[PDB]
Amino acid sequence: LRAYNEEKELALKQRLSQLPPPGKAFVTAKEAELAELAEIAALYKTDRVGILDILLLGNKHARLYRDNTALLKDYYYNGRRILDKIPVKVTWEIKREGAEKEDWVNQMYFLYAPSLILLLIVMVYKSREDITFWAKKELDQRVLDKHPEINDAPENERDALIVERIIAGDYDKLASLQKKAT
Amino acid sequence: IRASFDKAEEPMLGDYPDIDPFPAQLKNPYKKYDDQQDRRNLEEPLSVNDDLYDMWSPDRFTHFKNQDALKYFIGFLTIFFGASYVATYFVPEKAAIPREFPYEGLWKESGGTEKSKAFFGQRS
Amino acid sequence: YNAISLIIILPCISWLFPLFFGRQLGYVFVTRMTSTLIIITTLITYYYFYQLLGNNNPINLELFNYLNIDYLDINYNFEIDALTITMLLAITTISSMVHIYSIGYMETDPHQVRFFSLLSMFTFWMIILVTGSNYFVLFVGWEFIGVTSYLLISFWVTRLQAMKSALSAVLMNRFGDAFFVLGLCVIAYVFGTLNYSTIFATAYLINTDLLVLIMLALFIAAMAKSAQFGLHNWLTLAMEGPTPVSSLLHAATLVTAGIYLLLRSANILEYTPTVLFIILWIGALTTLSAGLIAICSNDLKRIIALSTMSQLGMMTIAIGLSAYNLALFHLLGHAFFKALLFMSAGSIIHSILNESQDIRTYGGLLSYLPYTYICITIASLSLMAMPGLTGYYTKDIIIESTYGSYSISNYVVYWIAYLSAVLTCVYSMKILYLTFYSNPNNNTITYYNAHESNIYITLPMFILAIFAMFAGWILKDIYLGVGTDFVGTHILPNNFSYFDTEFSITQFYKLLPLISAILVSILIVVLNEFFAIVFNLNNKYINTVYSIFNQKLVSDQILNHFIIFKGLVTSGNIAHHVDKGSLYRLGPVGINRLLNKASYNVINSSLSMNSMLILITIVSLLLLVLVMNVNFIIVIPVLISILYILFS
Amino acid sequence: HQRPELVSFDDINYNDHKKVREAQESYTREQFIRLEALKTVRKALEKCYEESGPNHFEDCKNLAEQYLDMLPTHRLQGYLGYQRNDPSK
Amino acid sequence: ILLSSLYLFNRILAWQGNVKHFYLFASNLLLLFIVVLYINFNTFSNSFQFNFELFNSLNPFGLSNSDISNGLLFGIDGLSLTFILLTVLLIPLTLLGNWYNINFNSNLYYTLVLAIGLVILLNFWALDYISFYILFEATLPLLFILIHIYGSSDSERASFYVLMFTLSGSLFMLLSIVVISIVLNTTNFINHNLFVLSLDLQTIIWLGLFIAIMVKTPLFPIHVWLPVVHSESPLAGSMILAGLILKLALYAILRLLLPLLCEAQILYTPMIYIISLLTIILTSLATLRQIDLKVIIAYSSISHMGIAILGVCSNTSLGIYGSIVLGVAHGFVSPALFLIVGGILYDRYHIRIVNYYKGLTTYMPQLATYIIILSFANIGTPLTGNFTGEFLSLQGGFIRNPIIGGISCISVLLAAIYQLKLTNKLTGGISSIYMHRTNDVTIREKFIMNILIISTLIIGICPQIMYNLLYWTVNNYIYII
Amino acid sequence: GRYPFPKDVISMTGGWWANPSNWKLNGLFATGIAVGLALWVSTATLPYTRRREGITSESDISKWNAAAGVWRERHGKISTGEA
Amino acid sequence: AHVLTKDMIQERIVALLESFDKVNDAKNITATANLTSDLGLDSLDVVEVVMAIEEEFGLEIPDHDADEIKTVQQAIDYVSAQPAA
Ligand SMILES: CCCCCCCCCCCCCCCCCC(=O)OC[C@H](COP(=O)(O)OCCN)OC(=O)CCCCCCCCCCCCCCCCC
Ligand SMILES: CCCCCCCCCCCC(=O)OC[C@H](COP(=O)(O)OCC[N+](C)(C)C)OC(=O)CCCCCCCCCCC
């Protein structure tokens, strides 16, 4: 994507020069000058350069474009605030229902929200390798290891048998780890 | 000015108006006010302890004095409790002996054990 | 089709869908839809109750785990048993009726979507409260009903008194909740779990001091919830909310959460007789005080609420006797006719152009409002336990269990509760007479325009009337049966006395409450209609005692001045004198002053002076070291003094 | 399913960190197994109680007493107490 | 990469002129990177996993694989991972909450904010006392500058408080760290429970460490700087300070104090309980008589930290888990309340006095709903993480000392009092005469508040979802023979 | 009766006397979502439902109590109040 | 619901004064009549009248305003100025 054109900025600059400052540019509230303010402010949302030129070109074009965009920003938002009118469509219409995108929404909505969704998913699924499940499996395996005949019993009788054996005996190894105690 | 806690603050003000605080709830509600709900007019001076005297402050009641209301509260409680306690003495005795249960009071069925039948076990 | 699932989830839908979509649906559909969902829930609950009476094998619903740390294993577990199904009967019946009633009562108001959503929310969270299988889910419901109570009592947000009442209610119930949290901590420590099954399995073996601690904490919570005399002031402030809210709160659910908490804890309660004693006597005190205030109050809703308080204390007594079935049955029976009282009161208020609630300004409306009169009359007669009515089979037998109690001391409680009953007949008759039987007191235009309410208001009163006449008789066997095993609470055989209270009772004690009730009713009516002077005297002393009784027994004064206001004053003392006083002294401000002075002193003839300085340093050092050689302890004060000279 | 080999603090030289970590982890895992035993006891007690109802006392006395017994001993206690102290001396 | 990325940064700056889009993008990438790390994190092991070393003599500018380790150590276990995830969640919201209200030197402001966030995130990675202390102090210059330049009217005094109080505590922390360094000649966190100092020396070191903890948490009676620094901080400073920098204290207890000074901690625990009960009761009461919105919200945090401390020194697994969960829930909720009071109301009306505000429901119903939800969350409604934290912390505290914990159960009531007293006045009544109607909460503000609300609700309904990272930690620090 | 109210105030509850002109069609959508959610959850939670008694056998109960006695005898365990 | 009209207020007030006994005459009661002068009401009798008026229309008159109304026109306009009447 390359869209810069130095011919257009060197023209846009004096097209701006004719206009009063954006602070005082609408304080009248004739319609002709307000119309030109409408089109020039509309230029703000008409994106005019992509990535291939910001990477490649020199900084004089940079400063000029930066000043141009600053003044376009001011005209657009000052009109939009002191007129209750959008600078699109080109003379100042009221059609505020939709066609409004703030700059933060793309980054946040398309990166941050997916990231939190991913975090929730990862936590839910990392919750499965919990020590409680590991210890239930280990206790079951210890019972089966010491006492493999309940491996012959049918499925529904098994679990009751393991529970019986767990209740009766201390299948843990903790005291075995505490050798200096005795 | 009136209350002890407002009086306590008098050395701690320097060049601030020593206002006499009046409960805003007791300001009669038919005068007109800039904010009718708070019964305050604009730029009215505020007492240092204002937050205890505005409309949002805990309600105050005018009927009885606080000390008098305390007397009544404690009096009701004392007379009720004392009358009940003294009434416990002038009590009729029952007519049927309390009920009993088989197996030494079912001390087996409420858990229990042979070595401890006093902890668990009925009148038998 | 799963009864328990639909029971928990339809009210949840009726709550959330209005909140999600109210702007898209509008209050017409929102009202109709929430009402319909609650009706379906109620029908499902009835069917479940029918089957449970057929087969007492409760359904359990066990869902994902809340907590699995160390020994504590908490799960979202729900069950519906005899106790729970009784509570759910009360809750769903009255919620459905109130939802229907609010269509008519609230037809004018701008904000109906929010109102109906809140009613449904409160129903849902109460169902969660009574259905959960461990104390944690109980607590979740316990606090969310408090949140909804805050949101309902302050429904008319622009009214200052409304929000102050909402704050009062939420804060007092948060007191109850602080004690409940203390209880939860001790339960978890002592038993290692919160589940009902384990606690009830191993309760009888536990040390009694620990049980008393647990049960005192939980009873303080229920005391706050059930507006016993310790924590009751919010109960009468709550009628700041709309009348349907008061109908739901004071009959079926919000005030019955405490009684349910005690009833669920019954198995624990048995092994802790001390708290049972305390519960019994607090209940007696509450019923007496509520009746006394009820006589001398002049607001319709306040009267009905104080009646609620008295009945709550009476079931508290029933708990104190270990007659748990007795108190449960009264709770269920009381819910119905209490809701009917409140609804009829709402109709009476709505009939007046002024919409006044004062009883001294209603005059005679018996000709104008016969249907409301008959509904309120049925409700009152059920409440006075007139023979052959639902309130009879609850109230009379609770009164008699006190005399039948094995403990000798409970005979005083008999006379206290008896006084409370005739006390109750007094204010019921006062309201009835002053609303329908007295000469008109309101201006002429109101009596011209006085008319009945719409169908949405009338039908639920009709249904609650048939309930408040027939339910007690049709259900007396289930809860008060000679050998009934429906409610499975394990009563200590020593404590059980329900046979003794029936066989030992004499004709005098078994007839005296009924005869006194009928006489005192007639006496009050005839005295009002024929000798008004005896009521409308002018004695100074009697006016004083009446004033005491009228202001909630001057308790509200005591609280607001001696607890709340003194605490605000003490908070001011802390925040100023400690925090912005002493702590800043030993902080930025004191240090700033100290450094200012010390720095000024150390800065406070460019040559001669400096030469004098160097001599003084040399000689001072020599003498100081001489002293140090002598004894080092002696030089410390000298150094302190030198620094005092230089810096101060 | 992993079954790491058990190590004890008493045998090891505390200067090999791998062994010390293994001892700490082994002690923790044994505590967790003991917890599982306690929970199994408690679940059996719950089933016993729910099915025995009125005679749960006689039916479940053994389970209730055993659960109450294992409660103070089968919780977590952490390894610092035992690695930092040698009980012999 | 770094060279190329620097080029990208420079070009974006030259063309766009405001760095803030680049910083938002960067922070989102950092969040994604930490999530990737969580994916690859082994939870069946109590060992630090993503280790690396900096400023080692053999490679001062790179990572060290040498057999002698004289640089600074970094690495994570589950306990560090939890707080790191919290941090990377909070940073982009901190950038976003000031997206429009900073119109001057904005690039510097966003740079300071992102730098503070990165410093805290790195601080959680530190694995030895010296690097922990370095990154623990590195924020103070940034906070000082930020508060002084972009703060409200009383910001100069605020900046001086935030620097001086924290330095005051940190230097006693430095005494303790120096004593440990010269006594052990080691500083790491990996094996510092293996060294058993004499009881007297433990008792002495514990004093410096706990003085630092008193100033930073804060605890009574040295909490008076926090309400100021909060009230005059800009929104990003307040959100960061409430949501991360306070949790640095709790992490400091768990990481620096408990594994090394176990016996001295056992000796000193009742003193800790005295101080925590003091902070809870007294600050909760003092909150009743405040007249500034941000000051009241600031006072709430101190009480919740008091409950956190009571949990973390309870010598029980439940107490520690409750302290961690309460820290996380507080990091979700308190930034939201600060967002309300200091970014919505303050940016619309530029005042914080409570008397001006009343009846906001009529014009701004959505803001009123948000206030109600956040306040019931702050006072500990169940199905919110705050309730789980307070409940578990109180369980641990009651077990450790039944009387003190039982009395501490009054915090539920006290919190309800101050918070609901505030929200009662704010939401209801007739719309204030002093202020005029303004817009309701916007899409950005609603987005931030929704993030925080859903986070606290998620961990409030199923607090177990954190256990996979913390089940080692709940045993790593309790001292039972 | 009624009074004027600001139309710009947007509340998810709808505000003042909210009664949208397409309320019947939105109502059809709402009731469809309602039946869908209620039925889905009623079916989904069906497997987690069970009765209280009759789940385990007397065999399991008695053998578990016997095992508990065995455990209490391996250790030295007297009963409550047995002293 | 119910809404009153100025003429309804005036009619109710006229009937009220008609039934009062201490009045001089019934026919002489005019819309602009002065109770003090035309109807010859006492200091306290007009007080009784204002109490009757508030009891009839269901309102509450402050002390400063009750004494201000001297003519029946003043009373009718005052009662019409209050929304809840
Ligand atoms: C001014 C305050 C005082 C300053 C003192 C310290 C300043 C440090 C400057 C920041 C530099 C640290 C961040 C980069 C170091 C990590 C680079 C790395 O490669 O990670 C090493 C680790 C192991 O990698 P390896 O062994 O090579 O195996 C790779 C297998 N494929 O691989 C991993 O496991 C990944 C490790 C991820 C680390 C996350 C770090 C969080 C924040 C990153 C940027 C922070 C910049 C801070 C700026 C403010 C200053 C504090
Ligand atoms: C609107 C209320 C509906 C509730 C019931 C309807 C659900 C239908 C399925 C029933 C099973 C169930 O509810 O659990 C849902 C799942 C499945 O858990 P399970 O193993 O099957 O349950 C165990 C049953 N045992 C004990 C028989 C084995 O648990 C979980 O992922 C836990 C994570 C919590 C949710 C993540 C937070 C996101 C919420 C966002 C907050 C705003």
mmCIF file of N, CA, C and O and ligand atoms in Angstrom, chain C residues 62-64, chain E residues 461-462, chain F residues 41 44-45 48, ligand 2:
data_model
loop_
_atom_site.group_PDB
_atom_site.id
_atom_site.type_symbol
_atom_site.label_atom_id
_atom_site.label_comp_id
_atom_site.label_asym_id
_atom_site.label_seq_id
_atom_site.Cartn_x
_atom_site.Cartn_y
_atom_site.Cartn_z
ATOM 1 N N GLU C 62 -26.465 -31.374 41.174
ATOM 2 C CA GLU C 62 -25.087 -31.099 41.555
ATOM 3 C C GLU C 62 -24.339 -30.598 40.333
ATOM 4 O O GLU C 62 -24.251 -31.305 39.324
ATOM 5 N N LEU C 63 -23.801 -29.384 40.428
ATOM 6 C CA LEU C 63 -23.147 -28.725 39.303
ATOM 7 C C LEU C 63 -21.679 -28.448 39.600
ATOM 8 O O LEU C 63 -21.125 -28.981 40.566
ATOM 9 N N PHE C 64 -21.037 -27.640 38.753
ATOM 10 C CA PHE C 64 -19.601 -27.404 38.834
ATOM 11 C C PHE C 64 -19.171 -26.898 40.202
ATOM 12 O O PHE C 64 -19.993 -26.438 40.997
ATOM 13 N N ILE E 461 -17.417 -16.413 40.258
ATOM 14 C CA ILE E 461 -18.332 -17.545 40.178
ATOM 15 C C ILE E 461 -17.563 -18.857 40.256
ATOM 16 O O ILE E 461 -18.062 -19.853 40.792
ATOM 17 N N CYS E 462 -16.342 -18.885 39.723
ATOM 18 C CA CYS E 462 -15.492 -20.075 39.726
ATOM 19 C C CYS E 462 -14.075 -19.658 40.093
ATOM 20 O O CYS E 462 -13.188 -19.610 39.233
ATOM 21 N N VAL F 41 -31.236 -25.733 28.724
ATOM 22 C CA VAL F 41 -30.631 -25.982 30.022
ATOM 23 C C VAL F 41 -31.337 -27.134 30.728
ATOM 24 O O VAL F 41 -30.693 -27.954 31.395
ATOM 25 N N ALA F 44 -29.748 -30.101 29.287
ATOM 26 C CA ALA F 44 -28.312 -30.206 29.537
ATOM 27 C C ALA F 44 -28.022 -30.605 30.976
ATOM 28 O O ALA F 44 -27.101 -31.386 31.236
ATOM 29 N N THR F 45 -28.790 -30.080 31.926
ATOM 30 C CA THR F 45 -28.583 -30.398 33.330
ATOM 31 C C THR F 45 -29.237 -31.707 33.743
ATOM 32 O O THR F 45 -29.118 -32.098 34.909
ATOM 33 N N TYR F 48 -26.967 -34.459 35.511
ATOM 34 C CA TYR F 48 -26.463 -34.156 36.844
ATOM 35 C C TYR F 48 -27.528 -34.275 37.923
ATOM 36 O O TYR F 48 -27.293 -33.859 39.061
HETATM 37 C C1 LIG H 2 -27.593 -19.267 33.524
HETATM 38 C C2 LIG H 2 -27.201 -20.397 34.516
HETATM 39 C C3 LIG H 2 -27.055 -21.777 33.822
HETATM 40 C C4 LIG H 2 -26.338 -22.816 34.727
HETATM 41 C C5 LIG H 2 -26.566 -24.262 34.264
HETATM 42 C C6 LIG H 2 -26.637 -24.373 32.721
HETATM 43 C C7 LIG H 2 -25.344 -24.958 32.110
HETATM 44 C C8 LIG H 2 -25.605 -26.253 31.299
HETATM 45 C C9 LIG H 2 -24.532 -27.334 31.620
HETATM 46 C C10 LIG H 2 -24.622 -27.797 33.095
HETATM 47 C C11 LIG H 2 -23.225 -28.065 33.725
HETATM 48 C C12 LIG H 2 -22.626 -26.780 34.350
HETATM 49 O O1 LIG H 2 -23.341 -25.920 34.736
HETATM 50 O O2 LIG H 2 -21.221 -26.633 34.460
HETATM 51 C C13 LIG H 2 -20.629 -25.947 33.364
HETATM 52 C C14 LIG H 2 -19.213 -26.516 33.178
HETATM 53 C C15 LIG H 2 -19.302 -28.044 33.122
HETATM 54 O O3 LIG H 2 -19.034 -28.514 34.437
HETATM 55 P P1 LIG H 2 -19.431 -30.089 34.835
HETATM 56 O O4 LIG H 2 -18.166 -30.900 35.004
HETATM 57 O O5 LIG H 2 -20.283 -30.696 33.747
HETATM 58 O O6 LIG H 2 -20.275 -30.102 36.277
HETATM 59 C C16 LIG H 2 -19.849 -31.056 37.250
HETATM 60 C C17 LIG H 2 -21.071 -31.967 37.618
HETATM 61 N N1 LIG H 2 -20.609 -33.166 38.397
HETATM 62 C C18 LIG H 2 -20.167 -32.676 39.727
HETATM 63 C C19 LIG H 2 -21.710 -34.169 38.325
HETATM 64 C C20 LIG H 2 -19.433 -33.781 37.758
HETATM 65 O O7 LIG H 2 -18.444 -26.166 34.291
HETATM 66 C C21 LIG H 2 -17.410 -25.233 34.015
HETATM 67 O O8 LIG H 2 -17.034 -25.079 32.901
HETATM 68 C C22 LIG H 2 -16.776 -24.407 35.169
HETATM 69 C C23 LIG H 2 -16.260 -23.027 34.681
HETATM 70 C C24 LIG H 2 -17.212 -21.865 35.068
HETATM 71 C C25 LIG H 2 -17.737 -21.090 33.826
HETATM 72 C C26 LIG H 2 -16.674 -20.104 33.266
HETATM 73 C C27 LIG H 2 -17.033 -18.616 33.557
HETATM 74 C C28 LIG H 2 -17.795 -17.928 32.381
HETATM 75 C C29 LIG H 2 -19.107 -17.234 32.850
HETATM 76 C C30 LIG H 2 -19.142 -15.711 32.535
HETATM 77 C C31 LIG H 2 -19.602 -14.877 33.763
HETATM 78 C C32 LIG H 2 -20.487 -13.670 33.390
#
